[PDB]
């Protein structure tokens, strides 16, 4: 569990601000790269579960985000 953005009105830099954008993305990126076959599974399951276009898109995004970060 990472610390995350502090609440102490900091106009300066935190401990690791260089990785502040990629810290919550490197795992998902490296997982989807080596495991590209899931992108089709998530798309199919989202298309078959959503009755609307918005529902299908949200299902696909949620599945493609939950698979790398297993919980």
């Amino acid at each position: 569990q990472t610390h995350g953005e502090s609440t102490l009105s900091n106009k300066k830099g935190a401990w690791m601000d260089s990785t502040k954008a990629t810290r919550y993305l490197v795992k998902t990126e490296s997982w989807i790269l080596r495991n590209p076959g899931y992108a089709l599974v998530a798309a199919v399951i989202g298309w078959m579960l959503g009755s609307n276009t918005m529902q299908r898109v949200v299902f696909t995004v949620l599945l493609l985000l939950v698979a790398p970060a297993y919980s």
């Binding site: 569990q1 990472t2 610390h3 995350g4 953005e5 502090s6 609440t7 102490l8 009105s9 900091n10 106009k11 300066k12 935190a14 401990w15 690791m16 990785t19 502040k20 954008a21 810290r23 919550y24 993305l25 918005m54 949200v58 995004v61």
Partner: protein
């Protein structure tokens, strides 16, 4: 100390009917108060310093395992229990292992195993709490007087000239009257006990560097921890690995140093300075009320300088719409005021821009006296005229921007301050209006609800949820729920982008 040369600088205007101003002094930020017929002052908190830190809990990130012993048990019997389990500082684990007539056993099955090892911590990360009675802020007030480029940042010169002062703001002494000779005196009424919410942070020292971490995050670390002034460690099974069940000797090794895993976990923590059981923090905020009624303008009894001035260099923009320039006075007329002004053209000659250094004058009586002056020219082309007649010098200046762009930057900075301070941002620049109080109460309740709902999220979760809520609001049949979802999605997207990540 002073606002000159700081990217974070705000300008508050003094109301003619108000005797005090309410401002939130943020760390690494500076506030400039400009009032009519009063000297300009710079109020800036330097740091928050709390001594006598009390140790709370020390996590271990580098353990040592030795004195291994294993005791086996026959299947269809009770569980195995090693004799070293009675001795303290020993971590034991139960497991199953294959037993039979080859292992000297009597039955075939999964026999019970019991392996113990001595747990010894090498380096630990101590977490300390901040007692709200030991905190003290260092606030610095600087009145814009006669300064040079060298002496502007020199605190010794400004203290000797009685134009600045660093003073401690404690809960037991929340008010301080800074005597500025011939400039009157300024009084600040600050709220030290409510400035930085020290009850929500721990002072964690990981090796040689110290951080300011959340309490909920610190109590969720899965590491061997011990209480204050205690050598008994708990949750010691994390830093130990039981390799494989063996009937005679199961191997137990300690994991590597978790010092790097801690540094990776302290991603958003704020690094602080810790020495002599005292933590120094240059971040945070401090709500103060600046009393400026007894603040009198110095140099109002001097005459205008009669000799010629010169620009010691090209005037420089500060990025905050102001211009700083250094003049040099040739004459020896003693203390004399400088006839410097910003005009729109060399034929109008009427003042159009405001001077930040109100009533500038040459302090010393010797020749070649350097004076630093800060002005605020209008947007567009203007001229910085010094003197009159044949000794008049002027410098053309172009100020890029407009009042509309300035208003956009101002409202963006206000939104960022509201996102960074919460309800405390309504007390910035306030003079006690009824609108500010209602706004602060509404922000208090709405922010309490908003934090209770969407607290603990990162900028990615906040951004995704805000986009989803906007998509749900634009596709909502009703009007009320649609506007609510739009507002929540907008504030979530703003909080996501405000991190700049």
């Amino acid at each position: 100390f002073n606002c000159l040369g700081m990217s974070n600088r705000d300008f508050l205007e003094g109301v003619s009917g108000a005797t005090w101003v309410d401002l939130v002094l943020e760390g690494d930020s500076c506030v400039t108060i400009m009032s009519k017929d009063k000297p300009t002052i710079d109020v800036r908190m330097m740091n928050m310093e709390a001594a006598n830190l009390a140790e709370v809990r020390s996590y271990c990130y580098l353990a040592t395992v030795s004195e291994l012993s294993t005791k086996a048990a026959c299947p269809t019997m009770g569980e195995a229990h090693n004799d070293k389990r009675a001795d303290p500082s020993f971590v034991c684990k139960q497991g199953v292992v294959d037993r039979g007539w080859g292992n000297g056993c009597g039955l075939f099955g999964k026999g019970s195993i019991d392996t113990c090892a001595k747990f010894a911590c090498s380096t630990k990360a101590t977490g300390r709490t901040i007692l709200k009675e030991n905190i003290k802020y260092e606030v610095a007030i600087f009145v814009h007087g006669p300064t040079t480029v060298e002496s502007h940042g020199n605190y010794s010169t400004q203290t000797g000239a009685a134009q600045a002062g660093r003073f401690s703001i404690t809960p037991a002494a929340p008010s301080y009257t800074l005597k500025l000779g011939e400039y009157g005196e300024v009084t600040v009424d600050c709220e030290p006990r409510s400035g930085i919410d020290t009850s929500a942070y721990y002072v964690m020292t990981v090796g040689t560097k110290t951080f300011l971490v959340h309490r909920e995050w610190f109590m969720d670390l899965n590491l061997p921890w011990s209480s204050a002034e205690s050598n008994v460690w708990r949750n010691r099974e994390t830093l130990m690995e039981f390799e494989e069940p063996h009937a005679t000797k199961q191997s137990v090794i300690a994991l590597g140093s978790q010092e790097g895993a801690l540094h990776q976990a302290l991603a958003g923590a704020i690094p602080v300075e810790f020495s002599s059981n005292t933590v120094k923090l240059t971040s945070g905020h401090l709500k103060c009320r600046v009393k400026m009624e007894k603040l009198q303008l110095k140099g109002t009894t001097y005459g205008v300088c009669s000799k010629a001035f010169r620009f010691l260099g090209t005037p420089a923009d500060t990025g905050h719409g102001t211009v700083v320039l250094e003049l040099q006075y040739t004459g020896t007329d003693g203390p004399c005021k400088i006839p410097i002004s910003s005009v729109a053209s060399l034929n109008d000659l009427t003042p159009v821009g405001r001077l930040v250094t109100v009533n500038p004058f040459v302090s010393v009586s010797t020749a070649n006296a350097k004076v630093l002056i800060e002005l605020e020219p209008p947007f567009g082309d203007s001229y910085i005229v010094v003197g009159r007649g044949e000794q008049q010098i002027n410098h053309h200046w172009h100020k890029s921007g407009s009042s509309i762009g300035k208003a956009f930057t101002a409202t963006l900075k206000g939104a960022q301050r509201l996102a960074a301070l919460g309800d405390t941002a309504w007390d910035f620049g306030s003079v006690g209006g009824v609108f500010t109080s209602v706004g602060k109460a509404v922000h208090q309740v709405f922010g309490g609800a908003f934090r209770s709902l969407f607290g603990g999220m990162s900028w990615i979760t906040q951004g995704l949820l805000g986009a989803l809520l906007l998509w749900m609001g634009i596709n909502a049949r009703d009007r009320s729920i649609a506007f609510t979802f739009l507002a929540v999605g907008g504030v979530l997207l703003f909080l996501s982008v405000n991190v700049h990540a």
